[PDB]
Symmetry: none
Subunit: 125 residues, 2 copies
């Protein structure tokens, strides 16, 4: 069971976004049998947001995972799932170094593996 979570490489500059814009990339993997995965935001990211030092909160979205109130999930039995988290078109994005913290879970049927993820994405000038 392996999890990789990191900022995307594309630069984001302060302002109001024309389009959906990548901010994080996630990969969840396990050769062992499973039903799927959860990505649960933790601490300040609760709500599914990325957060700067000055407390500015920005929503994350992904087209590779589903959402259920406060977390992402997906039923996927394959060995490996990839996901991009993007910021939505229109969103104003302001000052700083924005951190996402969460916890990945692997489940069956019941959680059988889990690991914290954290990464920080930069915005601006």
């Amino acid at each position: 069971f392996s999890v990789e979570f990191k900022a995307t490489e594309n630069e984001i500059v302060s302002g109001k976004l024309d389009a959906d814009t990548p901010a994080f990339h996630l990969v969840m993997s396990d050769s062992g049998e499973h039903k799927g995965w959860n990505v649960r935001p933790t601490g300040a990211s609760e709500g599914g947001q990325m957060v700067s030092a000055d407390g500015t909160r920005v929503d994350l979205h992904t087209n590779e995972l589903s959402w259920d109130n406060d977390h992402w999930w997906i039923d996927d039995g394959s060995e490996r799932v990839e996901a991009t988290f993007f910021l939505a078109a229109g969103d104003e994005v302001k000052a700083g170094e924005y951190q996402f913290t969460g916890r990945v879970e692997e489940y069956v049927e019941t959680v059988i593996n889990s690991k914290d993820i954290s990464a920080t994405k930069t915005v601006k000038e």
Copy 2:
């Protein structure tokens, strides 16, 4: 001593597999006297997997060979051994062109007397 190793002809689509589904075919030949063979996965395939570009792994299986921790093997002294490697019924298969790499070894009782790398790629899907 010859080895033939290649992707099967049957088309695979991504999704949950409804049956044991062929992926590769292996032929190991020697009319010379020998005890058996090993088929040892190499590189990314170690563990017994075919591995796609993005690193996704699918387990390979065969009913024609035995297994010893990390490799297949068979005592078979005949001139020719065939084997087919299949994906297990129910496995959800996804994204890519999946390669298997390994090494074949022919052994005798007394001990390896011939060896050769094998490599092939199987396409999945859509």
